[model samples]
Target chain A: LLFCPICGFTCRQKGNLLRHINLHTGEKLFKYHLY
Target chain B: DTSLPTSHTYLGADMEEFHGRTLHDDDSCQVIPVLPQVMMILIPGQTLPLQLFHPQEVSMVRNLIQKDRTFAVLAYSNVQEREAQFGTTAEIYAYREEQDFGIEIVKVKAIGRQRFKVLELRTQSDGIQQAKVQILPECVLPSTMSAVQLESLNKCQIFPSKPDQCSYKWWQKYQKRKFHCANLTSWPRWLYSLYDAETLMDRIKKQLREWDENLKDDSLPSNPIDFSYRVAACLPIDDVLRIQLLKIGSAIQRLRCELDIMNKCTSLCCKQCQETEITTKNEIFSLSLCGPMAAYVNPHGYVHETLTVYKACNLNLIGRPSTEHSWFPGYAWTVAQCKICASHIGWKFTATKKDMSPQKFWGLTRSALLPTIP
Candidate 1:
């Protein structure tokens, strides 16, 4: 099991845990541009 | 059931006359009005419903209805060049005009027709853009073939007798030999049989039913060309991939590409992040009457091709639920954004009434999704 260190969000997949951590850090890997 | 406003009148009783009309070589080149849609790719056999409020747009539709009731919708993206090169012609079937507080509003229901390449575009006096477009030809094989050629092709070890026996790599190799074979003489009739439309259609239909058993057979088109376009339009794929499907000239090739996409795609991910999973293919369901994926416009005139799914993960809902201007009649919408990248993915809709089916669902914008083929 993978657990988010920040929020303790538990998931079976590491990818899901990594994604859940983004909610706490507010790190936006994907950016949207208008131009 | 969700239906159109009672005030709207149906004006497409004679629309059947225009259906099944073949476009000849003579009808290839023509000047038509162009409607530029950002992040929306209209494919043939797809239904496009429009609500025109701008005076310029209303004027364009009025003039268009007087003519052939045809216009081209160019798929425009901000990152692309200043002007778009490819588009699909939309033929209006149902048109209605109503006067709303001194403003004329037009509601139109149209179906995508032929795909075309823009030769030249010029701005009209009324701010509408007109373009000279050349309709692209479909390189479909004729239905009738000589029996002798079929017997010879079957005898050849390279040719697969059954559709299931043919692989993508084999098709690629055959494509390479096509040019060499064509240089000597016409392609053998058996060569076309390998990519037979009916056989491919049956396979695709079976696969689609496996994805969603609720998918009705009548909803899919019978003609190979229409069937290809229908699948291309409805798939929860990015606009870039969808445009690639539109650019393919042959129905057989398009069907093969669609089947490949269907086979590969298992999950939907955030287009911006690419790694964050939002939903799986099994969760996809049709929310609107027009299949699972359909184009809907906001009050500001931006069109979003939304794919409805029953469940999603790694998402955040930003705003409170609001029923004002809700696309789904009995549901209130909340802004849904990607948790990883904070992109505006789509919306989360909750049913307002107790007895309404689909108490909650998510409408993910196709532009914001990247199909993960795993």
Candidate 2:
């Protein structure tokens, strides 16, 4: 579980955090690839 | 209680307390029993047709049939999951015997209305297990279904005794063609249709572009479990929203979250529910030449939602239930497409190659290995 540094909310997964960061940047950092 | 662990011992026992099979009676038992390794969803009056393929059910059925007319089934209740020693008893009904895949598909109608934490589960010398569980009267959704639901359910009375051999055989074969819709459903088909309306690309292009590296990366995991995490790796929902989905522990809760956030996604869209469903289906089909085909940079290949791509993935068509292998086999592709314009939105595919990182994402995994789209 991950917690927000500012608001202190929690996350069930670590991937959620990377996705969460995108909210601040308005950027998508992870790729969706199916090979 | 002739508790020496015999099949005959249990026959009279089930008759004594129906779905109640007392496992341990060490004075006042303290530990709670687990319902065993079933991670399934059960709705009141809606019997989850389970294809008991594992050795556990196989042995369980054989042990019961060996007896005169004795069998019991249990459900996991709301109490805190406990050790294998203590759990609640279930009110099992519609017990039926079936043969499928060389395993007995024990058909039992279950009403998980009353809650119970198990206290004991004991497999006896005859191979049948004895279990003890406490009962709570409140676990069931007393009014889960409206009058309409109960009316339909009553119209179709569920059976408890062994299902007919014919249906058992048919279910076995049909199960072979079944797929898990959870992983199979793509955002475009499942979530996007409800939530978003902008051209798929304009809405998600900024996000889609960022994933180009991972798409080209050489490292990716092969296992679907690993792939699910990988799928979630790239989500861009607000933190609060993401937490909402992650917080749901049960599969039902997970499904609810899927619909909930999807509705939120649709709420951001220009079209409403019923209208969007028709429009997306129509637009995408037109864009891809009746779809299953998307004109793209990679002329050799292009990804769409799992349906067309599964047919296009150029792999052996896996017969479902019989094999976890999806129709796409091993992996699949989920590309976001606009319902309005059918343009590319954020897309992800399950990398069939070894060395992929993170867990397989939802839209990406061959998780829902079949095109079980309703």
Candidate 3:
């Protein structure tokens, strides 16, 4: 399980919030969540 | 009781709408954008084939061509009443042009997904034969949900000693989940279904195959047994007798219902059956053949027709014709079960038989088979 870094909602998928949040913060936590 | 499988139908509840028109007298078409939870067969990802007969659909196709769009989503209607809101939405993938009106046929290539409901109905303007049915919002999965699902699906970490045996051994990982539930009826199976046609049918077929295969060790019905799918497959009317099969409740009722329809369908396609044959000259029709073929000539997907038919002919003087297309998928097998006692009905073959014969199988048959229509 994963969670939104900003929020506390339990998420089943990873890289969801990180993918969007990094747009503003310029952070790339995932290099291999590809495909 | 009216459940249908989703796999066989296309279009999931989604938010895509098309600019469509209806065909009516004086340019008005009554094609409504109302969604029916009706069951329709659609294979996910693969392009679906469609034959449009209704005039409104013909105009819809033409209008889509003008705008360079070619996919129409379908929704299943569980309730048979008119909707004040949206219905199914289809997107255009591909299509072929027709030469004449009504006389010409449209060959369509499209993908079915993104189901919707009908929200509004629009009519074609005067003098031009067409109408438009506006639709509503669609279905969406959670943002994080897909990744989690795919991770588990793509784990694939088996290392069997033999190269070819890797897949076999890897499948063992899934066995626990497979046998975890004895009743496949309770399991959720996603369909390429648009409306809700195969919901009940798919459940029944899945459950029947799982239970039977567990007891006798077999596979499943490759093609669905619902009516709309039959229409899509281009099966003739008698084959649609499977429609009659839908009313059955228990396992035996379904088996007998299928057998009855199969028998009737086989009667139509037998070359020797004395039925209406059209003479090419002057477009005349005539009855040919001296009697019904001793064996059903329905050569479905089976390569061993000679042996299967030969054995069936010996069982009784009864003859069966084939309505199933030889090129497309078709079903074959013979069943004989007790009419009473709900026990031990004999089956020589199976609904999913490529080869391996039934070692004389049986099912539990009971009364209440007859339900008065009135």
Candidate 4:
């Protein structure tokens, strides 16, 4: 069994974990606030 | 309940008479001789929480605590080697003190109360910044009104008797109304605000709910001027633009500008959902990702602080880490791809050291994000 560390998605196969990773990573942008 | 904050009780119940007198009579103008300096820009209607670390500043805070507890906060503009033309006088709302390394640091929470224009700036021999300032007069609109009159004025934007389905029809009316509104010399000055206080607050309320999820306590400001400044403060726009907003004396004019900026900002939003899940003002390496006070840049860059971004949404870590970048020793860098589009957005630098300040932080390239609107 493989456990995806980022979102805690569990799967029996390594390929399944790779597929589930897309759910967390879609279109990302970071922000900045230095006040 | 229209309860005003205690610090600003000086505004009092007779705001209209106070405003009228301040505007009409030069003798009514209140001027402050000297005010202590802090490198901060305060927008009217916004609250500023500060930590006074300097010895001189600590003494100033101590003095303020004993007396009126009011001080001027002038925007320190680094570009032209001086402060901005305008500033706000803030009254201290709350305070605390910390003793660090046998040094006393004063922490205070204050709100901007009055606007002032800098007549002259001088540095006293005591290493304090004293400014001869002219207090800007306030404009108070008539408050008491019938509910029906309020309703009609509240929906000031009128569309040509058309259905609500066609937004373009509503937009056309908006442009026409705005043009006529600009030429309204016959109308009373107080009625110039297209949206009433209630409408303005409602718009802000909606924006806060859908816009920044990290704002912790997302309550709206009841005071009209305070609401405008609060909006300006939360905006992730440039510091120069914020300075521009601080200079505007009229609250209604400021609110109009605030709404314009907000509209443009929300347009950039999240690339995937097209919803503004992220804004330029959000802290990337915040407490959520890295623990409190976890990271800092290399302390050198182009013209100033290096633009180092961390924590990206909608990104998936690709493969395992490879030892690289001698700049950050004991850290392994791994590429993160945009989950939807599969583009190389940035790298996640994970510290292998057990006792590390930041175990990991996403070093996102600014180019990977949305472009700034001109």
Candidate 2: where are CA atoms >4 Å away? A1-35, B1-37, B41-45, B53-109, B119-131, B139-374
Candidate ranking (TM-score, best to worst): 1, 4, 3, 2
Write model 4 residue lDDT over B1-374, tens digit each, in one string. Answer: 11222122221222111111112132234444233434446666555555555566667767866666667777656524765577777777666666645755555666677777777788878776667667776565553232224333456544445343475556445444543434435554235435456445555655554443443433556777767766775554545676788777666667777777766653222333434233343333222211111112110100000122344566677656655321245567675656666544455668788897567766543323442453
Residue B373, candidate 2: how far off, in angstroms?
Answer: 22
Which has the better lDDT: candidate 1, or candidate 3?
Answer: 1
Expressed as tens digits, the lDDT of each residue in B261-370 for candidate 3 is 32333321112122322111111111101000001111110011111111221121111222122211233233322222211111233234455333222111111011
User: Residue B64, candidate 2: how far off, in angstroms?
Assistant: 6.5
Interface RMSD for every prediction, one decimal? 13.5, 19.4, 27.4, 15.0
- Considering only N, C-alpha and C atoms within 3 Å, which residue pairs clash in candidate 1? none
DockQ of candidate model 1: 0.03
The predicted structure with the larger TM-score, 1 or 4, is 1
True contacts kept of 2: 0.00
Instruction: Report chain B TM per candidate.
Output: 0.78, 0.26, 0.30, 0.53
User: Which portions of model 3 miss their true places by more than 4 Å?
Assistant: A1-35, B1-48, B53-56, B68-81, B84-86, B97-102, B125-374
* TM-score pick, better of 3 and 4: 4
Ranking by DockQ: 1, 2, 4, 3
What ranges in model 1 sit over 4 Å off?
A: A1-35, B1-27, B36-39, B77-80, B142-194
User: Looking at every candidate separately, what fraction of the true A–B Cα contacts under 8 Å does it contain?
Assistant: 0.00, 0.00, 0.00, 0.00
Candidate 2 per-residue lDDT over residues B1-374, each given as its tens digit: 11121121211223222454333232332322222333322222222222233455445544544442223234323313412311222234435554534533444323322223355566666433566545422211221222223332343333333233775464333322221122334322234222222112122322222323222222333332222222222232333343343333233333334434322442111111222221111111111111122111111011112212211221221111211112223344343332443322223335465764322322211111211112
